[PDB]
């Protein structure tokens, strides 16, 4: 995260760390039930970079605060049972449908530091996914286009689709939204390397619940003027999400 600040203890209890058993931080992820994690497909599979992670290559770490300490009595580390990538994920061109589900080997237990985020309903999505409304991104990724000691947080405004489109050469899909301040705004912030797969969440003003609207997906550099971070559009892919849990867990 660039230009963010340290998270408060238990501020983002659905925040998950995708950890490679070299033992390294792959990406964030989010807890949506006691057995299901949501992340970016590219965190697992990106053939251009020769990245194709399997169930047995990874570990999921939940309830974490610190990036590197093993937080004895606080975090829980699970083994994956199965990985599901969106059948139409487009890794060949624009990371369209950049989403995967990981089903844990065993249901995790909730605690002050571990709690699932909600998935939006069409109507939550309809009223919140508006240009200028702010969401929150979290992660342990780079601080600069080094690495934080604790979880970072940044609040960012959703930007109008045209503005998104006109900032890049990549073709933008209905499955993506972009967020960030405009050069004029004199407020910065962005996700950065290592933040991928983390949650873009918003707090509903109707029921005071936190909803995960986006997934950290792609961008070009970190916190560049006139550029914006791009996120997977969770609601547009919710059908696929339900389909898998239902058809399998």
């Amino acid at each position: 995260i660039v230009e963010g600040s340290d998270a408060e203890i238990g501020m983002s209890p659905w925040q998950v760390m995708l950890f490679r058993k070299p033992q390294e931080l792959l990406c964030g992820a989010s807890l949506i039930s006691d057995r299901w994690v949501l992340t970016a497909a590219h965190c697992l599979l990106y053939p251009p970079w020769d990245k194709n992670f399997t169930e047995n290559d990874l570990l999921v770490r939940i309830g974490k605060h610190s990036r590197t300490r093993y937080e004895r009595n606080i975090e829980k580390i699970s083994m994956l049972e199965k990985i599901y990538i969106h059948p139409r994920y487009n890794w060949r061109e624009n990371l369209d449908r950049d989403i995967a589900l990981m089903k844990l080997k065993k249901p995790v237990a909730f605690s002050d530091y571990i709690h699932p985020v909600c998935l939006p309903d069409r109507e939550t999505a309809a009223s919140l996914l508006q240009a200028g409304y702010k969401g929150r991104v979290t992660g342990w990724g780079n601080l600069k286009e080094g690495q934080p000691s604790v979880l970072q947080v940044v609040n960012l405004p959703i930007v109008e689709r045209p503005v998104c489109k006109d900032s890049t050469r990549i073709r933008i899909t209905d499955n993506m939204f972009c967020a960030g301040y405009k050069p004029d705004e004199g407020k910065r912030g962005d996700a950065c390397e290592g933040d991928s797969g983390g949650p873009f969440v918003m707090k509903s003003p109707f029921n005071n619940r936190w909803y995960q609207m986006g997934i950290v997906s792609w961008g070009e550099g970190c916190d560049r003027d006139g550029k914006y971070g791009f996120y997977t559009h969770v609601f547009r892919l919710k059908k696929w999400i339900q389909k898998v849990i239902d058809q399998f867990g």
């Binding site: 931080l25 570990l59 093993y70 580390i77």
Partner: peptide
């Protein structure tokens, strides 16, 4: 990274 339990 501080090492993690081996049981994991």
């Amino acid at each position: 990274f501080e090492e993690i339990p081996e049981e994991y």
